[PDB]
Design an enzyme around this catalytic site. Structure first.
Site, PDB file in Angstrom:
ATOM      1  N   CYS B 108       0.805  -1.232   0.000  1.00 58.26           N
ATOM      2  CA  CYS B 108       0.000   0.000   0.000  1.00 58.26           C
ATOM      3  C   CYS B 108       0.828   1.268   0.000  1.00 58.26           C
ATOM      4  O   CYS B 108       1.589   1.556   0.948  1.00 58.26           O
ATOM      5  CB  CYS B 108      -0.965   0.017   1.189  1.00 58.26           C
ATOM      6  SG  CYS B 108      -1.940   1.514   1.304  1.00 58.26           S
ATOM      7  N   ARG B 111       0.000   4.666   2.795  1.00 57.63           N
ATOM      8  CA  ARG B 111       0.073   4.425   4.225  1.00 57.63           C
ATOM      9  C   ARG B 111       0.429   5.655   5.069  1.00 57.63           C
ATOM     10  O   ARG B 111       0.291   5.610   6.256  1.00 57.63           O
ATOM     11  CB  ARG B 111       1.020   3.261   4.524  1.00 57.63           C
ATOM     12  CG  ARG B 111       0.390   1.884   4.291  1.00 57.63           C
ATOM     13  CD  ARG B 111       1.422   0.833   4.618  1.00 57.63           C
ATOM     14  NE  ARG B 111       2.451   0.730   3.580  1.00 57.63           N
ATOM     15  CZ  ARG B 111       3.578   0.038   3.708  1.00 57.63           C
ATOM     16  NH1 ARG B 111       3.840  -0.582   4.847  1.00 57.63           N
ATOM     17  NH2 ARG B 111       4.451  -0.035   2.689  1.00 57.63           N
ATOM     18  N   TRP B 280      -9.243   6.403  -0.726  1.00 55.05           N
ATOM     19  CA  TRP B 280      -9.555   7.116  -1.973  1.00 55.05           C
ATOM     20  C   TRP B 280      -8.559   6.689  -3.075  1.00 55.05           C
ATOM     21  O   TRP B 280      -7.509   6.123  -2.793  1.00 55.05           O
ATOM     22  CB  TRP B 280      -9.529   8.640  -1.788  1.00 55.05           C
ATOM     23  CG  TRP B 280      -8.278   9.185  -1.180  1.00 55.05           C
ATOM     24  CD1 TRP B 280      -7.085   9.426  -1.813  1.00 55.05           C
ATOM     25  CD2 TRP B 280      -8.082   9.557   0.191  1.00 55.05           C
ATOM     26  NE1 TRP B 280      -6.164   9.922  -0.918  1.00 55.05           N
ATOM     27  CE2 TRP B 280      -6.748  10.009   0.319  1.00 55.05           C
ATOM     28  CE3 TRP B 280      -8.901   9.532   1.332  1.00 55.05           C
ATOM     29  CZ2 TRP B 280      -6.216  10.458   1.545  1.00 55.05           C
ATOM     30  CZ3 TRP B 280      -8.377   9.985   2.544  1.00 55.05           C
ATOM     31  CH2 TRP B 280      -7.048  10.451   2.635  1.00 55.05           C
ATOM     32  N   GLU B 285      -4.804   3.878 -10.841  1.00 57.07           N
ATOM     33  CA  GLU B 285      -5.574   2.663 -10.602  1.00 57.07           C
ATOM     34  C   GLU B 285      -6.715   2.549 -11.632  1.00 57.07           C
ATOM     35  O   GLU B 285      -6.955   1.465 -12.179  1.00 57.07           O
ATOM     36  CB  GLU B 285      -6.164   2.657  -9.183  1.00 57.07           C
ATOM     37  CG  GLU B 285      -5.112   2.576  -8.029  1.00 57.07           C
ATOM     38  CD  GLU B 285      -5.803   2.670  -6.671  1.00 57.07           C
ATOM     39  OE1 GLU B 285      -6.363   1.641  -6.244  1.00 57.07           O
ATOM     40  OE2 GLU B 285      -5.799   3.748  -6.029  1.00 57.07           O
TER      41      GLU B 285
HETATM   42  C1  HEM Z   1      -6.324   6.480   1.833  1.00 55.86           C
HETATM   43  C2  HEM Z   1      -5.964   6.338   0.551  1.00 55.86           C
HETATM   44  C3  HEM Z   1      -5.290   5.072   0.011  1.00 55.86           C
HETATM   45  C4  HEM Z   1      -4.606   5.030  -1.147  1.00 55.86           C
HETATM   46  C5  HEM Z   1      -4.315   6.208  -2.144  1.00 55.86           C
HETATM   47  C6  HEM Z   1      -4.169   3.670  -1.320  1.00 55.86           C
HETATM   48  C7  HEM Z   1      -3.420   3.217  -2.375  1.00 55.86           C
HETATM   49  C8  HEM Z   1      -3.253   1.880  -2.651  1.00 55.86           C
HETATM   50  C9  HEM Z   1      -2.896   1.318  -3.931  1.00 55.86           C
HETATM   51  C10 HEM Z   1      -2.657   2.149  -5.209  1.00 55.86           C
HETATM   52  C11 HEM Z   1      -2.780  -0.007  -3.759  1.00 55.86           C
HETATM   53  C12 HEM Z   1      -2.453  -1.083  -4.811  1.00 55.86           C
HETATM   54  C13 HEM Z   1      -3.830  -1.385  -5.405  1.00 55.86           C
HETATM   55  C14 HEM Z   1      -3.781  -2.324  -6.552  1.00 55.86           C
HETATM   56  O1  HEM Z   1      -2.862  -2.223  -7.412  1.00 55.86           O
HETATM   57  O2  HEM Z   1      -4.692  -3.195  -6.588  1.00 55.86           O
HETATM   58  C15 HEM Z   1      -3.095  -0.330  -2.380  1.00 55.86           C
HETATM   59  C16 HEM Z   1      -3.070  -1.610  -1.846  1.00 55.86           C
HETATM   60  C17 HEM Z   1      -3.478  -1.968  -0.592  1.00 55.86           C
HETATM   61  N1  HEM Z   1      -3.907  -1.101   0.404  1.00 55.86           N
HETATM   62 FE1  HEM Z   1      -4.137   0.970   0.142  1.00 55.86          FE
HETATM   63  N2  HEM Z   1      -4.564   2.909  -0.219  1.00 55.86           N
HETATM   64  C18 HEM Z   1      -5.325   3.725   0.597  1.00 55.86           C
HETATM   65  C19 HEM Z   1      -5.977   3.346   1.774  1.00 55.86           C
HETATM   66  C20 HEM Z   1      -5.970   2.090   2.340  1.00 55.86           C
HETATM   67  C21 HEM Z   1      -6.727   1.671   3.491  1.00 55.86           C
HETATM   68  C22 HEM Z   1      -7.739   2.510   4.303  1.00 55.86           C
HETATM   69  C23 HEM Z   1      -6.390   0.414   3.754  1.00 55.86           C
HETATM   70  C24 HEM Z   1      -6.949  -0.449   4.898  1.00 55.86           C
HETATM   71  C25 HEM Z   1      -7.316   0.104   6.075  1.00 55.86           C
HETATM   72  C26 HEM Z   1      -5.442  -0.026   2.745  1.00 55.86           C
HETATM   73  C27 HEM Z   1      -4.790  -1.243   2.678  1.00 55.86           C
HETATM   74  C28 HEM Z   1      -4.259  -1.809   1.535  1.00 55.86           C
HETATM   75  C29 HEM Z   1      -3.976  -3.217   1.340  1.00 55.86           C
HETATM   76  C30 HEM Z   1      -4.213  -4.374   2.343  1.00 55.86           C
HETATM   77  C31 HEM Z   1      -3.435  -3.317  -0.073  1.00 55.86           C
HETATM   78  C32 HEM Z   1      -2.987  -4.589  -0.843  1.00 55.86           C
HETATM   79  C33 HEM Z   1      -4.275  -5.047  -1.512  1.00 55.86           C
HETATM   80  C34 HEM Z   1      -4.059  -6.283  -2.296  1.00 55.86           C
HETATM   81  O3  HEM Z   1      -3.098  -7.059  -1.977  1.00 55.86           O
HETATM   82  O4  HEM Z   1      -4.880  -6.479  -3.221  1.00 55.86           O
HETATM   83  N3  HEM Z   1      -5.170   1.041   1.937  1.00 55.86           N
HETATM   84  N4  HEM Z   1      -3.320   0.857  -1.719  1.00 55.86           N
HETATM   85  C1  LIG Z   2      -8.666   1.051   0.337  1.00 48.71           C
HETATM   86  C2  LIG Z   2      -8.090   1.210  -1.038  1.00 48.71           C
HETATM   87  C3  LIG Z   2      -7.730   2.468  -1.521  1.00 48.71           C
HETATM   88  C4  LIG Z   2      -7.192   2.530  -2.813  1.00 48.71           C
HETATM   89  N1  LIG Z   2      -6.809   3.698  -3.389  1.00 48.71           N
HETATM   90  N2  LIG Z   2      -7.051   1.421  -3.563  1.00 48.71           N
HETATM   91  C5  LIG Z   2      -7.392   0.195  -3.126  1.00 48.71           C
HETATM   92  C6  LIG Z   2      -7.197  -1.004  -4.061  1.00 48.71           C
HETATM   93  C7  LIG Z   2      -8.382  -1.206  -5.032  1.00 48.71           C
HETATM   94  C8  LIG Z   2      -8.710  -0.024  -5.951  1.00 48.71           C
HETATM   95  N3  LIG Z   2      -8.028  -0.329  -7.228  1.00 48.71           N
HETATM   96  C9  LIG Z   2      -7.621  -1.710  -7.332  1.00 48.71           C
HETATM   97  C10 LIG Z   2      -8.183  -2.343  -6.037  1.00 48.71           C
HETATM   98  O1  LIG Z   2      -7.376  -3.381  -5.501  1.00 48.71           O
HETATM   99  C11 LIG Z   2      -7.955  -4.646  -5.791  1.00 48.71           C
HETATM  100  C12 LIG Z   2      -7.215  -5.270  -6.962  1.00 48.71           C
HETATM  101  N4  LIG Z   2      -5.937  -5.810  -6.510  1.00 48.71           N
HETATM  102  C13 LIG Z   2      -5.397  -7.032  -7.077  1.00 48.71           C
HETATM  103  C14 LIG Z   2      -6.093  -8.213  -6.421  1.00 48.71           C
HETATM  104  F1  LIG Z   2      -6.041  -8.064  -5.112  1.00 48.71           F
HETATM  105  F2  LIG Z   2      -7.348  -8.240  -6.843  1.00 48.71           F
HETATM  106  C15 LIG Z   2      -5.415  -9.512  -6.716  1.00 48.71           C
HETATM  107  C16 LIG Z   2      -5.611 -10.201  -7.912  1.00 48.71           C
HETATM  108  C17 LIG Z   2      -4.956 -11.419  -8.122  1.00 48.71           C
HETATM  109  C18 LIG Z   2      -4.111 -11.939  -7.140  1.00 48.71           C
HETATM  110  C19 LIG Z   2      -3.926 -11.236  -5.949  1.00 48.71           C
HETATM  111  F3  LIG Z   2      -3.117 -11.705  -4.985  1.00 48.71           F
HETATM  112  C20 LIG Z   2      -4.576 -10.029  -5.736  1.00 48.71           C
HETATM  113  C21 LIG Z   2      -7.926   0.079  -1.841  1.00 48.71           C
END
Ligand code: HEM
Ligand SMILES: Cc1cc(N)nc(C[C@H]2CNC[C@H]2OCCNCC(F)(F)c2cccc(F)c2)c1
Ligand code: HEM
Ligand SMILES: Cc1cc(N)nc(C[C@H]2CNC[C@H]2OCCNCC(F)(F)c2cccc(F)c2)c1
Ligand SMILES: C[C@H](O)[C@H](O)[C@H]1CNc2nc(N)[nH]c(=O)c2N1
Ligand SMILES: C[C@H](O)[C@H](O)[C@H]1CNc2nc(N)[nH]c(=O)c2N1
Ligand SMILES: [Zn+2]
Lengths: 407, 411
Positions: B108, B111, B280, B285
């Site tokens: 993320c 953070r 947000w 994305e």
């Molecule tokens: C506040 C604005 C935030 C922004 C701009 C942001 C941005 C991002 C982005 C760009 C990613 C990668 C998404 C992707 O490629 O699918 C991500 C992943 C992630 N974020 Fe954030 N995030 C935000 C808030 C949060 C919040 C509130 C949480 C949880 C409380 C969170 C937890 C995570 C987690 C667990 C991942 C990995 C998700 C996955 O493995 O699919 N983020 N974040």
């Molecule tokens: C809370 C928050 C804020 C933010 N800006 N953005 C996010 C991630 C969202 C939005 N924009 C993409 C989506 O994240 C969900 C898509 N991520 C890839 C996957 F998790 F789906 C995935 C696929 C296959 C294998 C694997 F391990 C994981 C969350």
């Protein structure tokens, strides 16, 4: 033990077994991944020699043949008596091609088997090295129709008689620190430029001064040579739409030729082994031109495009970035100097991965380096899982020689 | 032990000690790096040490390590585990736990915001209808008419793995996908399978390009149930471009609220299988991945056509050129409608400042470079040049298998 890699765009799953033949360490553990870190005796030599010869004789389908066992006893005898050994021409060629094949950070490996190897193991002096190097440059350049090559100088002996090219690439531009406090030319090369000047070089003090070669033979003190200008092909950079682009005064050289790595074949160490291919456009247009600690030209270009530089969210940096890279490819193509775009290179590398999985059981690959520095996810390699592991023969990094040389 | 990371742009070198508290495995070994692999019912025995580690961390964070309050809480949890096989978190521990799962999320980039998270405690929820209500409230609170606020809603923890709360949607708000008989896809091809499940369950599909999916919600291990989010709760932005007037006529929109709903939150050994969270968007994305992936809306061709770019050769960089214009459009649109969004320059710059602060105050910041580096213009963002160390800290967010794969249907 059998490992899967998935492509998330196409769903294609490949199975890797080649990693089991992996020998050296990655820097990662089960607790920590170091995937984004840039730099993570006779008794030693014989297993190393044996492992290499086994893979060599297998490749020519003569594993466990007399020719195989004969070569093993011969090298064994040679190591046991002389502490080192000499590669046959065939082995040298095979080892060089394979070090390239195993280069996990190289996107251009579809070409691995088309590599001209220049055996320079009979070289004894720095003038000799210079002659070999000019011949490599001219051969590889081929008036713009580039051909991949490596020139291999004598192997390490006791380590006090190393052959080294002090330059990081055969062709690079000088970098000068100024009274102003800014940098003129390429800031990456300030220290090397100073070492050249202090050893006698006559620096023109321009923005794009081709550096002299600084060649070390037989562990002796290195010497300066100027590559004949007629052998250094350069490309004036213009834009197919923006007439003003040319006024920026930009050029780059056609031949990318890495000269500071170590080639390891069968436990033998070749500390001077300059090699060259041709450019992928982003190396010049994204990294050389736009890195902040490099030519750092984004501000200037954006200003000429009259973009709104007030806020990051106008994506002015991104916009100018595309334009700069369009110019690089157009200029090279117009002057008929081989270049590849990041779309075409990454597509070929996916095809190469598939061939390697089919014919070799895998392909070691470092995603962090394979994915281009612009437009990551619109290239196929972004969506391709890759396994990174170290195979031999290999190219390795080595300490800059000035840090270690006893004058 | 000390590990160093370097920034190759600034020469700033940082020292990591926090990786020493790291527990779980990466997937990597000394012989292989699995840094680009996407994915590389407990016992009393294993539970109390997880509880203890967590509570020690919580009590240190409040400067009460080794206090009577700390000791009594350990005793009380210990007794609860031996008696009931599990335990309940205090409100304070839940809030701390959820904030720290975000803090520890190495993938993320957002953070810097970790300590500002609204935590909605939904552990008294018992039915799918209750889940729907909690989720509508989270969506309305988080949306805040465009001025987005980070939130998480936490449904009851796993007990025997037979009574799980799950949100079947991968995000609270997503567009339907429909596979056509001629093999083309209408809407989002990422959601074809989920859309089919929804239809089977009885959703009437409008069959357009941007149909907000219904929530499919599982309470207490029961078969899931369908609910339509009230459309007035679903904030959407029509996409237009500041200079190109034809851009509106592509008919693109996107929703404002990114809200991941399929992850598992682990806190002190407890498992929260339904814990939707939202923040947000970072512009890329949507403009890069959702719009431009080959397997998503795939609009690059149509955009470059309308821009009249030379499309006969990849080396014209028509794809890169259209890509930038699309991403300008997304940022422009959100900003004009006053819906919170961050561009990839600003977001990555903020991440570097967050990372450096974390090294200084906490002894490290686990970070996954593969994910942190934005999917366009990688090297003109400062994260590209930043070395990172990836390791796993708890509390944490983890992936879980899609529930339609594992669920026992009751009928
Ligand atoms: C506040 C604005 C935030 C922004 C701009 C942001 C941005 C991002 C982005 C760009 C990613 C990668 C998404 C992707 O490629 O699918 C991500 C992943 C992630 N974020 Fe954030 N995030 C935000 C808030 C949060 C919040 C509130 C949480 C949880 C409380 C969170 C937890 C995570 C987690 C667990 C991942 C990995 C998700 C996955 O493995 O699919 N983020 N974040
Ligand atoms: C809370 C928050 C804020 C933010 N800006 N953005 C996010 C991630 C969202 C939005 N924009 C993409 C989506 O994240 C969900 C898509 N991520 C890839 C996957 F998790 F789906 C995935 C696929 C296959 C294998 C694997 F391990 C994981 C969350
Ligand atoms: C034929 C055209 C070639 C192309 C298009 C190409 C492409 C590239 C690129 C883009 C990089 C990353 C460089 C960087 O970002 O600094 C690279 C790295 C590398 N390549 Fe190639 N390559 C080519 C030929 C070769 C040849 C001929 C060899 C050796 C015989 C080679 C071996 C290597 C090695 C060892 C690296 C890693 C260098 C390092 O760690 O700094 N490549 N390649
Ligand atoms: C043979 C060939 C063909 C091609 N297209 N491109 C190349 C790479 C060259 C050109 N364009 C960049 C340069 O690559 C050499 C630079 N490599 C990395 C580094 F040496 F700078 C380095 C520094 C510090 C730490 C570290 F780990 C690595 C070679
Ligand atoms: C920190 C990070 O490992 C470093 O910036 C890397 C990232 N990827 C790279 N990729 C290539 N091809 N070349 C590079 O010099 C780098 N630098
Ligand atoms: C194979 C590869 O790891 C995969 O495509 C990853 C790469 N980096 C990513 N980075 C982000 N932020 N999101 C992603 O979905 C991905 N996908
Ligand atoms: Zn790793």
């Amino acid at each position: 033990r059998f490992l899967k890699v998935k492509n998330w765009e196409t769903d294609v799953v490949l199975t890797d077994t080649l990693h089991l033949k992996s020998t050296l360490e990655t820097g990662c553990t089960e607790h920590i991944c170091m995937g984004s870190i840039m730099l993570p005796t006779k008794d030693q030599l014989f297993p190393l020699a044996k492992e290499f010869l086994d893979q060599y004789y297998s490749s020519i389908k003569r594993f466990g043949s007399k020719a195989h066992m004969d070569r093993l006893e011969e090298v064994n005898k040679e190591i046991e008596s002389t502490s080192t050994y000499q590669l046959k021409d065939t082995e040298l060629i095979y080892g060089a091609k394979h070090a390239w094949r195993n280069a996990s950070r190289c996107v251009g490996r579809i070409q691995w088997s088309k590599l001209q190897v220049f055996d320079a193991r009979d070289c004894t002096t720095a003038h000799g090295m210079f002659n070999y190097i000019c011949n490599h440059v001219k051969y590889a350049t081929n008036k713009g129709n580039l051909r991949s090559a490596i020139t291999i100088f004598p192997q390490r002996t006791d380590g006090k008689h190393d052959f080294r090219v002090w330059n990081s690439q055969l062709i690079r531009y000088a970098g000068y620190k100024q009274p102003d406090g800014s940098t003129l030319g390429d800031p990456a090369n300030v220290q090397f430029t100073e070492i050249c000047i202090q050893q006698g070089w006559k620096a023109p003090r321009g923005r794009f001064d081709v550096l002299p070669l600084l060649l070390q033979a037989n562990g002796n003190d290195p010497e300066l040579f100027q590559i004949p200008p007629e052998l250094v092909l350069e490309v004036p950079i213009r834009h197919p739409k923006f007439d003003w682009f040319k006024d920026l005064g930009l050029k780059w050289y056609g031949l990318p030729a890495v000269s500071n790595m170590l080639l390891e074949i069968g436990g033998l160490e070749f500390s001077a082994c300059p090699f060259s291919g041709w450019y992928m456009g982003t190396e010049i247009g994204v990294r050389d031109y736009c890195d902040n600690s490099r030519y750092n030209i984004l501000e200037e270009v954006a200003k000429k495009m009259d973009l709104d530089m007030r806020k990051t969210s106008s994506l002015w940096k991104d916009q100018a970035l595309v334009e700069i890279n369009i110019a690089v490819l157009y200029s090279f193509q117009s002057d008929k100097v081989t270049i590849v775009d990041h779309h075409s290179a990454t597509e070929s590398f996916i095809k190469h991965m598939e061939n390697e999985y089919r014919c070799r059981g895998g392909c070691p690959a470092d995603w962090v380096w394979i994915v281009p520095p612009m437009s990551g996810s619109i290239t196929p390699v972004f969506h391709q899982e890759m396994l990174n592991y170290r195979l031999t023969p290999s190219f390795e990094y080595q300490p800059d020689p000035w840090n270690t040389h006893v004058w």
